[PDB]
Coordinates of C-alpha atoms in Angstrom, one line a residue:
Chain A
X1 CA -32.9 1.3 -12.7
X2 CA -29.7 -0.3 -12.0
X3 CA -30.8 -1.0 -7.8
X4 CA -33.6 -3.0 -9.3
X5 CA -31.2 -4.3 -11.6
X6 CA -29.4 -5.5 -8.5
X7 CA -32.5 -6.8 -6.7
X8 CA -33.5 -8.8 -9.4
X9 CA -30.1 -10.6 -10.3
X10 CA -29.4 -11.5 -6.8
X11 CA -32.4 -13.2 -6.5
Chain B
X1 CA -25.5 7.2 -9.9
X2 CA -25.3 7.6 -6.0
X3 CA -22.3 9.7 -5.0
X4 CA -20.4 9.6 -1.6
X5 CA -18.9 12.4 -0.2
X6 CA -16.9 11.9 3.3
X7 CA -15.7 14.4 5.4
X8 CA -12.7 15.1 6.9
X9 CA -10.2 14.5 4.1
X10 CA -8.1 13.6 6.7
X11 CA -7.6 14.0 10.4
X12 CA -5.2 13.1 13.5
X13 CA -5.9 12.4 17.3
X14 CA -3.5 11.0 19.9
X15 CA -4.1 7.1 21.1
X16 CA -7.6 7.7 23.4
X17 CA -9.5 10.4 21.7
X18 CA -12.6 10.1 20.0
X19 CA -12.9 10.4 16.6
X20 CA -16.5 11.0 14.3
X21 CA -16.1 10.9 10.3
X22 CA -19.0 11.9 8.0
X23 CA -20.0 10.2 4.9
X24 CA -22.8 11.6 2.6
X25 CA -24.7 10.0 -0.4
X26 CA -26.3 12.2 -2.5
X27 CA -29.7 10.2 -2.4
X28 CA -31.0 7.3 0.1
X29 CA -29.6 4.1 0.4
X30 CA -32.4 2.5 2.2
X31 CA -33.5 -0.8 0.2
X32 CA -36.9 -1.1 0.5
X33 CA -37.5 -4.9 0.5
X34 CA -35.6 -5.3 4.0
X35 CA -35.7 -1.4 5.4
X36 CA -31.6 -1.5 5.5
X37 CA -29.4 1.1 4.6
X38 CA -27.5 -0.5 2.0
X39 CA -24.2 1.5 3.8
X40 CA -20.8 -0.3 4.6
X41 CA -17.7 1.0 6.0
X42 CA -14.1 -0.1 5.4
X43 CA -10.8 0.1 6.9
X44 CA -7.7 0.1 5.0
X45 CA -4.1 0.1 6.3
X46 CA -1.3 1.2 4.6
X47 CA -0.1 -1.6 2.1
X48 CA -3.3 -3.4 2.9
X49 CA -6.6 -4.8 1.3
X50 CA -10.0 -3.0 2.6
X51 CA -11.7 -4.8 6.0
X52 CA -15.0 -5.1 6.3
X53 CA -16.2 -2.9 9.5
X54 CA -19.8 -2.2 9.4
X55 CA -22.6 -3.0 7.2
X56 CA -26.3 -2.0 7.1
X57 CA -25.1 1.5 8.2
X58 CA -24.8 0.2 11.5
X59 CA -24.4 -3.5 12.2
X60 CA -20.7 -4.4 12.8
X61 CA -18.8 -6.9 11.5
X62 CA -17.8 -10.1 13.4
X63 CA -14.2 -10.0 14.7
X64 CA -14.5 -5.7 14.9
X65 CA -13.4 -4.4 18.1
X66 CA -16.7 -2.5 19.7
X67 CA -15.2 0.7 19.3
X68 CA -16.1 1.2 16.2
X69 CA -19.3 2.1 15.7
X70 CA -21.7 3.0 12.8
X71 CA -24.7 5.3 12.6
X72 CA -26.8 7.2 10.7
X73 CA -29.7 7.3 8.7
X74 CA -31.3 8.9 5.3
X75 CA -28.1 10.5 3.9
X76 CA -26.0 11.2 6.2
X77 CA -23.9 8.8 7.8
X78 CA -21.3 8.6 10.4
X79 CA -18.1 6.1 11.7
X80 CA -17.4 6.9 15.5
X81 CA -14.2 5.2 16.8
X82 CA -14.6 5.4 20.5
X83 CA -11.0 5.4 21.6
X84 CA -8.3 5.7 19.0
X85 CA -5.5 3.1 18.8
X86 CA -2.2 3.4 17.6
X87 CA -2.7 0.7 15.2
X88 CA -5.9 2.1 13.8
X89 CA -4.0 3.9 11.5
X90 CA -6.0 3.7 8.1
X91 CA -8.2 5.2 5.1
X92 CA -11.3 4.5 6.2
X93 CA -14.0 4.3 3.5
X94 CA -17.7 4.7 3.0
X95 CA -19.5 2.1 0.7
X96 CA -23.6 2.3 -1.1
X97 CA -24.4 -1.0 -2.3
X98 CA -28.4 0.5 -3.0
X99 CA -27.3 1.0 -6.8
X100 CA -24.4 0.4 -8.8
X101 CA -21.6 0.2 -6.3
X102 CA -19.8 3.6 -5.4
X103 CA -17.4 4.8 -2.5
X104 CA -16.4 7.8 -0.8
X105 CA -13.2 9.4 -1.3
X106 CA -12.0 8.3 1.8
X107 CA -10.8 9.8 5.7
X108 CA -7.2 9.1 6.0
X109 CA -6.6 8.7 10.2
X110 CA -3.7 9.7 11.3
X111 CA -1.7 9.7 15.0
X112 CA -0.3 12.2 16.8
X113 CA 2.1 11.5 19.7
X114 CA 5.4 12.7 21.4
X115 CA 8.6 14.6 19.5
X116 CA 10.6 11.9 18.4
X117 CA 13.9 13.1 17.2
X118 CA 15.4 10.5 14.0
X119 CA 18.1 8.0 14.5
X120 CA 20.5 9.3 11.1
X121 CA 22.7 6.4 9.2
X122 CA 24.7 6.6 6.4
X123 CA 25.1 4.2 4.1
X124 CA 28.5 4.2 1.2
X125 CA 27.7 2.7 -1.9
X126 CA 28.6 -1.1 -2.2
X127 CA 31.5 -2.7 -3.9
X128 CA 29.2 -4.4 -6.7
X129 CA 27.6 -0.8 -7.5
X130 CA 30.6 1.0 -7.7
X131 CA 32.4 -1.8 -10.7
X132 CA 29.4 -0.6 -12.2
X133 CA 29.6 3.0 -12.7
X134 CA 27.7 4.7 -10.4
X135 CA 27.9 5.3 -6.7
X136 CA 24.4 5.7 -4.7
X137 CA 24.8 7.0 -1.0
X138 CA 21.7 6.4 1.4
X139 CA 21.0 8.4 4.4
X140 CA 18.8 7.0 6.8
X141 CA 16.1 8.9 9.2
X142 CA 14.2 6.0 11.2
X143 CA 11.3 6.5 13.4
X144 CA 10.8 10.1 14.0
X145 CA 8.0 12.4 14.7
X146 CA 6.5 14.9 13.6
X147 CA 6.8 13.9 9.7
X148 CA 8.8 17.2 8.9
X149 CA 12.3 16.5 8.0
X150 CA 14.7 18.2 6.2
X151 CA 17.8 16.0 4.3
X152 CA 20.6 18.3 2.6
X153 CA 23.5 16.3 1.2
X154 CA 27.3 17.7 1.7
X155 CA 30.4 16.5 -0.2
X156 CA 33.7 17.7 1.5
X157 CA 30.8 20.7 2.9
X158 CA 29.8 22.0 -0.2
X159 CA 25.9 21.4 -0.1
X160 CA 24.2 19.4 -3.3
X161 CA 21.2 20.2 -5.5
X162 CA 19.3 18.1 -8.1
X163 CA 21.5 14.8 -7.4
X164 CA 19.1 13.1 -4.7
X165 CA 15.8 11.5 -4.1
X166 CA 13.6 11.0 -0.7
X167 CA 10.3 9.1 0.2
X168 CA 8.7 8.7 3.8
X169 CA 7.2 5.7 4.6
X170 CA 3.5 5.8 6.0
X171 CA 3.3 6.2 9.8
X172 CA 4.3 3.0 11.9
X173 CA 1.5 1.4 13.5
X174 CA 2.8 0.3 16.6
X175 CA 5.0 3.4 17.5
X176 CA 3.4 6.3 15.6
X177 CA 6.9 7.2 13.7
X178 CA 8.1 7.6 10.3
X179 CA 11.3 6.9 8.6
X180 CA 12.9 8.5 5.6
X181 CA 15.8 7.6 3.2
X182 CA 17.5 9.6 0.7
X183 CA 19.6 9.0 -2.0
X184 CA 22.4 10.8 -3.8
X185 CA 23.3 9.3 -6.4
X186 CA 26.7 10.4 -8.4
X187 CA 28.9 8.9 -11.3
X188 CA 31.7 6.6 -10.1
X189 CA 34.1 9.1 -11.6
X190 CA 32.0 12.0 -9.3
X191 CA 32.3 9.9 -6.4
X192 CA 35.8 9.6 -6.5
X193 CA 36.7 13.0 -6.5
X194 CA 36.0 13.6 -3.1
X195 CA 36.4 12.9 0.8
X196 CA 33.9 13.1 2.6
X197 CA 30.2 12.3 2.1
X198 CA 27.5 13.8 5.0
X199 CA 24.2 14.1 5.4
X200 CA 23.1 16.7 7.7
X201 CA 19.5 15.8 9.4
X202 CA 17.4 18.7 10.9
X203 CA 14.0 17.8 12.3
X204 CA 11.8 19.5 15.7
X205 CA 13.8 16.7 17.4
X206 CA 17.1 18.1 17.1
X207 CA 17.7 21.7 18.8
X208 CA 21.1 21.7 15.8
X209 CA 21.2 19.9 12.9
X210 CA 23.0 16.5 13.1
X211 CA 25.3 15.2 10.5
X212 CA 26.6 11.7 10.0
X213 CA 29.4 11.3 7.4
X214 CA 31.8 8.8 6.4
X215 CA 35.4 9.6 4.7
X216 CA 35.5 7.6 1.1
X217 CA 37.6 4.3 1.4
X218 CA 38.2 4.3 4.7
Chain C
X1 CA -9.2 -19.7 6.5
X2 CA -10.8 -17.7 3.8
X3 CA -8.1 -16.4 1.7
X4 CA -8.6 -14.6 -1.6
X5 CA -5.4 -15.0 -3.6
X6 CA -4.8 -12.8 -6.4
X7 CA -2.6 -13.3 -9.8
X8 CA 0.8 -11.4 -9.7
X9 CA 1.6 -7.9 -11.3
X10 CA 1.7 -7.2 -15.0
X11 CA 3.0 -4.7 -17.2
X12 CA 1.0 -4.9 -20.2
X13 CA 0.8 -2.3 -23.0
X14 CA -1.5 0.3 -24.0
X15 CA -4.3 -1.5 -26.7
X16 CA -3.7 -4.7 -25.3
X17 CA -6.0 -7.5 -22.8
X18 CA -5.1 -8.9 -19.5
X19 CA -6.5 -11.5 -17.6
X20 CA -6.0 -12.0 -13.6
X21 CA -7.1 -14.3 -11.7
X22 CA -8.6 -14.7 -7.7
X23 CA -8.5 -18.1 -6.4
X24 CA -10.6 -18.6 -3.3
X25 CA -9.1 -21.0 -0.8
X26 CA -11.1 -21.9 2.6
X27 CA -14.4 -22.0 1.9
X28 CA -16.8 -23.1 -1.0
X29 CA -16.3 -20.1 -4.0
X30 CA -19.7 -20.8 -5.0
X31 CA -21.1 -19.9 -1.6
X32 CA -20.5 -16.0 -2.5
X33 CA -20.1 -13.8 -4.7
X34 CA -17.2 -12.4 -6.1
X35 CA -16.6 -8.3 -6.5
X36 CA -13.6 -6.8 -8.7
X37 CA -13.0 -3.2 -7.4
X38 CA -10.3 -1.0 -8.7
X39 CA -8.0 1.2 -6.7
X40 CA -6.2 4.2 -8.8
X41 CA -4.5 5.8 -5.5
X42 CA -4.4 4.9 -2.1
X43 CA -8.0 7.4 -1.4
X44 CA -9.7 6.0 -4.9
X45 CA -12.2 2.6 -5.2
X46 CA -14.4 2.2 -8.1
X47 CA -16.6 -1.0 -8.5
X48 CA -16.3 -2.8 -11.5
X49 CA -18.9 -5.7 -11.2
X50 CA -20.1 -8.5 -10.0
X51 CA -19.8 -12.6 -10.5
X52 CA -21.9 -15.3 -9.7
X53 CA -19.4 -18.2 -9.2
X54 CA -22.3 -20.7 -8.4
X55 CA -23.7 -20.2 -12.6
X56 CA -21.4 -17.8 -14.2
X57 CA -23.6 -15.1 -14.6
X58 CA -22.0 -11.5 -13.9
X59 CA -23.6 -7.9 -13.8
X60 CA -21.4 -5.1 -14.7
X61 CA -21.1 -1.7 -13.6
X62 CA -21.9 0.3 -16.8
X63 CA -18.8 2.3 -16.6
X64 CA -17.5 -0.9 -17.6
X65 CA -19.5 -2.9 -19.8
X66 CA -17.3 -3.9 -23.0
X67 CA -14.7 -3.4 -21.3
X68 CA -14.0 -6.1 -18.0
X69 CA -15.3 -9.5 -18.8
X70 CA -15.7 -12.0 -15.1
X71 CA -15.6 -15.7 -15.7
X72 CA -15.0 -18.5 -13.1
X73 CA -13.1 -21.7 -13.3
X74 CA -15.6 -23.9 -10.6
X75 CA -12.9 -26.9 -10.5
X76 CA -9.7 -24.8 -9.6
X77 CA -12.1 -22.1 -7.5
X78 CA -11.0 -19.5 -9.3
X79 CA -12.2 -16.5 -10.9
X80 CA -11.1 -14.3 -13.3
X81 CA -11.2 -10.7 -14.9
X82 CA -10.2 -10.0 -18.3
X83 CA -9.6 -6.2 -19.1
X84 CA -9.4 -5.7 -22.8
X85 CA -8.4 -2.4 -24.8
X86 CA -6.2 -0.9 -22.2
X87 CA -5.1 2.5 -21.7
X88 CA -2.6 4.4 -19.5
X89 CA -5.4 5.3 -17.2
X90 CA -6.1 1.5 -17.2
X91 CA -3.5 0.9 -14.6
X92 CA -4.3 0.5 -11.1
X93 CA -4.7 -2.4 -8.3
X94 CA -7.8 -4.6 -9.3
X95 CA -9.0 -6.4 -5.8
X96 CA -11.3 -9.1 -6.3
X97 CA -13.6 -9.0 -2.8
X98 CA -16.6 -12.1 -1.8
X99 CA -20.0 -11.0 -0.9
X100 CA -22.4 -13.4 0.6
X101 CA -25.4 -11.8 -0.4
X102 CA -27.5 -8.6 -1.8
X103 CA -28.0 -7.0 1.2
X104 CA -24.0 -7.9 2.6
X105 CA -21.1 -5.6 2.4
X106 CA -17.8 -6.6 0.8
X107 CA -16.4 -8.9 3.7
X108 CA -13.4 -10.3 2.2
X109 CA -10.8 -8.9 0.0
X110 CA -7.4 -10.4 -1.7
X111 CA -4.5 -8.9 -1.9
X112 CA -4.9 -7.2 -5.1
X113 CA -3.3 -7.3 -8.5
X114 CA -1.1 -4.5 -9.8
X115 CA -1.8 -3.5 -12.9
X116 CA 0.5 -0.7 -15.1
X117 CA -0.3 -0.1 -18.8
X118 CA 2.8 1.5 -20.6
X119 CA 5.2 1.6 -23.4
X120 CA 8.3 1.7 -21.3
X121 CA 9.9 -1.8 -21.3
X122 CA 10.2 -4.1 -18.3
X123 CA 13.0 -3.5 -16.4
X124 CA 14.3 -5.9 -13.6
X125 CA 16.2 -4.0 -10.8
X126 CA 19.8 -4.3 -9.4
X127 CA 19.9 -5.3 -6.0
X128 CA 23.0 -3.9 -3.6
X129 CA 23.3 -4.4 -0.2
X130 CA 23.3 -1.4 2.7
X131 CA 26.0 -2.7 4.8
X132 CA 26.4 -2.1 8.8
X133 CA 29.1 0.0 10.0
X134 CA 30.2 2.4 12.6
X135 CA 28.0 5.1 10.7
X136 CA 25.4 2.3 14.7
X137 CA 23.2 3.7 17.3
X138 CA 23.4 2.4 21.3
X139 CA 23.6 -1.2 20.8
X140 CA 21.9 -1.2 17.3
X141 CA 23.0 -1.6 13.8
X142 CA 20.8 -0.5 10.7
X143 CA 21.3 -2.6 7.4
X144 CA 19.3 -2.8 4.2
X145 CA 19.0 -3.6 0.5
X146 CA 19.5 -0.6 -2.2
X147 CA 16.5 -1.9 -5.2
X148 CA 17.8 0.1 -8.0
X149 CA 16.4 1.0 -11.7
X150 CA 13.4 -1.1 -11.9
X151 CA 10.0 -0.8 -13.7
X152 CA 7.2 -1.0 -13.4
X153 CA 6.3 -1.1 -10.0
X154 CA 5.8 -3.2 -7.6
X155 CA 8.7 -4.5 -6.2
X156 CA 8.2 -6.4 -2.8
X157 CA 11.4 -7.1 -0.3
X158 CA 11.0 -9.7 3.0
X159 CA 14.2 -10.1 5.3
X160 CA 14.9 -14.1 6.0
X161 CA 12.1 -15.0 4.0
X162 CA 10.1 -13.6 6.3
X163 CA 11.1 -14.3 9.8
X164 CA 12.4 -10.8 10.4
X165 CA 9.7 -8.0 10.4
X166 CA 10.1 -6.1 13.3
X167 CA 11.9 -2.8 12.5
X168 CA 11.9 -3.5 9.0
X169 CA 11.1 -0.3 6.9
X170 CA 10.7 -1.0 3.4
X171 CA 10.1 2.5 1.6
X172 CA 7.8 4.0 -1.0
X173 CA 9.9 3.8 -4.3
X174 CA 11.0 6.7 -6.3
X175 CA 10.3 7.7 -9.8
X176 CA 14.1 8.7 -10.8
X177 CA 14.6 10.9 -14.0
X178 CA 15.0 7.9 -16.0
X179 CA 11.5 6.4 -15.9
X180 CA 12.8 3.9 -13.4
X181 CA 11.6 2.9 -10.1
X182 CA 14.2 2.7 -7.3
X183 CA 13.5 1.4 -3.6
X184 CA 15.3 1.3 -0.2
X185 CA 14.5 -1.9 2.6
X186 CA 16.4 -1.6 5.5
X187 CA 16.5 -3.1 9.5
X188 CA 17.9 -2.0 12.5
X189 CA 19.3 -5.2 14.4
X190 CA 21.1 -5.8 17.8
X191 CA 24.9 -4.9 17.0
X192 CA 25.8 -7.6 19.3
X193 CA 24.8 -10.6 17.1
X194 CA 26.2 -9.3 13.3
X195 CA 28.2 -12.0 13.7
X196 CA 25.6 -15.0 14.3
X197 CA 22.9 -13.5 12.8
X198 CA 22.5 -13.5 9.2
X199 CA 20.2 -11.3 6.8
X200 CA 19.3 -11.9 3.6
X201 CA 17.0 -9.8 1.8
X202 CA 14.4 -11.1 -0.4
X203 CA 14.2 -8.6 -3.1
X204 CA 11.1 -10.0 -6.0
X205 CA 9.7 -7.9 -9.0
X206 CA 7.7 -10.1 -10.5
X207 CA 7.0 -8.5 -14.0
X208 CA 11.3 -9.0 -14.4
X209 CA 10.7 -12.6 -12.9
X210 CA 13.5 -11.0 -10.7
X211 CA 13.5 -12.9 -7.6
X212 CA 16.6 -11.9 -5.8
X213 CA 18.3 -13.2 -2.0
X214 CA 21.0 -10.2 -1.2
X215 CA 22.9 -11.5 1.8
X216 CA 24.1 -8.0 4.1
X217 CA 27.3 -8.5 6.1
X218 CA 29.2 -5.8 7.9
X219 CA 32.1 -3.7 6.3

């Protein structure tokens, strides 16, 4: 979903 | 996506009372990779951009004065303000930064202090206006309390309708007041056709109201 | 210091694109990111996206995908948000706020650019002063600037450029039957000094490129 969405682009 | 609901719409204290707001998501906002409540909470003053007061739900941000205070866990999440200030006038918003960012409608905070009655000008229109064609009169309320005031417009005492406009500014966040100003605005020819031009001010201040006038082109 | 400074306010009609930008001054813009949030009212804040000013990169809210477009300019540290196919409901303050990292709330914000989508033409405003007289208060003397017929909002007014804020009240503008925006700023000063003292307002509405100094004498 769009809060793994998150986790992954702010890696 | 993760909706915030907050809770009072709006509410007012006097400088030194507490004050608890509520702010609900409609699922958790705890990230699992660091066990924080991905929660922040803003205050935003009248004609200014957001500030940053607390993040992780409950961790506040540098430069915050200790009186604000964050807590909360799950869904359900509160902003405490230990002991109000005159200047903490604000909307104060909650924030969910779990998922695609979304913010609570808002608490507006607003002050309560003493009866201040309203210092009343009047204003003519200017010189330069009136070569022009039209002639705006401004009546002046400044830094009065409560925010109920009433403006009615008189030309030689016969009261106007339909020809005036009024705003309020937000409340003053050193003093607690507001301020109003109205404007009647009347053709040059109107304008002419008459003596004197009042406004007549009533507001919990004033035990009558009070009316300041000017005679035209004296 | 930080400082987030925002682009000015538009006017910009409906169908069309506009671009804004946010310049970050006092620290390294590629040290955070970089927010747009849009405010519709004073209780209203809906996020937009998100920019990476370090590569570029931007994830979008997928309310607006196709529409916003983020981009950065690494040399002159500044970012930008392009808005394309824009309707009446379009039009709203667009703040651009940093973000140091996933887990970090919105820590900085600019000062916000005004955007209004409409058909009604730009209109710059006629400035007339509010001139002291006997109709005074115990020592004081209130004086202002009348901002009439202007669109679209905002106009901003500073007295002396700035130097004179204390018991300034600059009022929320009225929509008049016309379309047109009209505003009052006005100052109560000591009634002692009208005659040393000078005040000037500084009356700007940037989508007129009006930028007006209204000197207020007495009489």
């Amino acid at each position: 979903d769009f809060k793994e969405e998150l986790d992954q682009w702010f890696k | 996506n993760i909706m915030m609901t907050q809770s009072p719409s709006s509410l007012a204290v006097s400088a030194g009372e507490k004050v608890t707001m509520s702010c609900k998501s409609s699922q958790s906002v705890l990230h699992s990779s660091d066990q924080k409540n991905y929660l922040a909470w803003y205050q935003q003053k009248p004609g200014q951009s957001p500030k940053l007061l607390i993040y992780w739900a409950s961790t506040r941000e540098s430069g915050v004065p200790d009186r604000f205070t964050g807590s909360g866990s799950g869904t359900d999440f509160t902003l405490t303000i230990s002991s109000v200030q005159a200047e903490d006038l604000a909307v104060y918003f909650c924030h969910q930064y779990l998922s695609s960012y979304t913010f609570g409608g808002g608490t507006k905070l607003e002050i309560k202090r003493t009866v201040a009655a309203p210092s009343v000008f009047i204003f003519p229109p200017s010189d330069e206006q009136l070569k022009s064609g039209t002639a705006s009169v401004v009546c002046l309320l400044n830094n009065f309390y409560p925010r109920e005031a009433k403006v009615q417009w008189k030309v030689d005492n016969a009261l106007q309708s339909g020809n005036s406009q009024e705003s309020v500014t937000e409340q003053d966040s050193k003093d607690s007041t507001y301020s109003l100003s109205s404007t009647l605005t009347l053709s040059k020819a109107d304008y002419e056709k008459h003596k004197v031009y009042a406004c007549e001010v009533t507001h919990q201040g004033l035990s009558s109201p009070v009316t300041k006038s000017f005679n035209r082109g004296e | 210091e930080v400082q987030l400074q925002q682009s000015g306010p538009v006017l910009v009609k409906p169908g069309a694109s506009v671009r804004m930008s946010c310049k970050a001054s006092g620290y390294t813009i590629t040290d955070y990111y970089l927010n747009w949030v849009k405010q519709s009212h004073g209780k209203s804040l809906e996020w937009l996206g998100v920019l990476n000013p370090y590569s570029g990169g931007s994830l979008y809210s997928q309310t607006f995908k196709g529409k916003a477009t983020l981009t950065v300019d690494r040399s002159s540290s500044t970012a930008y948000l392009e808005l394309n196919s824009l309707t009446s409901e379009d039009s709203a303050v667009y703040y651009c706020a940093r973000q140091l990292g996933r887990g970090n709330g919105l820590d900085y914000w600019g000062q916000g650019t005004s955007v209004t989508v409409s058909s009604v033409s730009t209109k710059g405003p006629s400035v007339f002063p509010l001139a002291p007289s006997s109709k005074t208060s115990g020592g004081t003397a209130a004086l202002g600037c009348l901002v009439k017929d202007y669109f679209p909002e905002p106009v901003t007014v500073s007295w002396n450029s700035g130097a004179l804020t204390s018991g300034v009240h600059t009022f929320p503008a009225v929509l008049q039957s016309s379309g047109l925006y009209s505003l009052s700023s006005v100052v109560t000063v000591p009634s002692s000094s009208l005659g040393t003292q000078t005040y000037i307002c500084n009356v700007n509405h940037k989508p007129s490129n009006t930028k007006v100094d209204k000197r207020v004498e007495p009489k």
